[PDB]
Design a protein around this ligand. Sequence first.
Ligand SMILES: [Cl-]
Ligand SMILES: [Cl-]
Ligand SMILES: [Cl-]
Ligand SMILES: [Cl-]
Ligand SMILES: [Cl-]
Ligand SMILES: [Zn+2]
Length: 180
Amino acid sequence: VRLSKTLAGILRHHPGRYGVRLTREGWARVSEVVEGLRKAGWSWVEEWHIVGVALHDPKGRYELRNGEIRARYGHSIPVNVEPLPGEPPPILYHGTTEEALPLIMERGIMRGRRLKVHLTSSLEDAVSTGRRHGNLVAVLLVDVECLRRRGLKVERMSKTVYTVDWVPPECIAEVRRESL
Ligand SMILES: [Cl-]
Ligand SMILES: [Cl-]
Ligand SMILES: [Cl-]
Ligand SMILES: [Cl-]
Ligand SMILES: [Cl-]
Ligand SMILES: [Zn+2]
């Protein structure tokens, strides 16, 4: 029912479901997205909403170019999006469920349905993120350098969002249980 939430699903997980075709670079035509949303019963949707959604997103979730749009990260579909300039901070956060900690302590942070593992520089974001699946959020502090030495590359997809294949258990510097 939320336009943005729905848009991110279309550009990250199910284009065709809405008749939208994406390139390897992840791009899509705004018009094609608009029609697709209309055919899905969103009658009032117009191209300007889509631009508004993209230009006002706080996380910098989307990108635009000559009548096109794509998500910058969070894809569960194979796609290639180039990173943004800027070395990562020494520590990056990642939210999740306390219930996931037992496993994570052993295995570390695993991929999930998304292609790569996402890490945020914003503590607040990590919380709301954890709060999205299951409750009793547990935010983990990830030592980036530790990752780089593990050889795992850390790429910047948006001002506050970065990704890596996985986070080794040993690169977790702190676990904070919201229940404590
Ligand atoms: Cl699909
Ligand atoms: Cl998602
Ligand atoms: Cl998100
Ligand atoms: Cl993730
Ligand atoms: Cl910056
Ligand atoms: Zn606006």
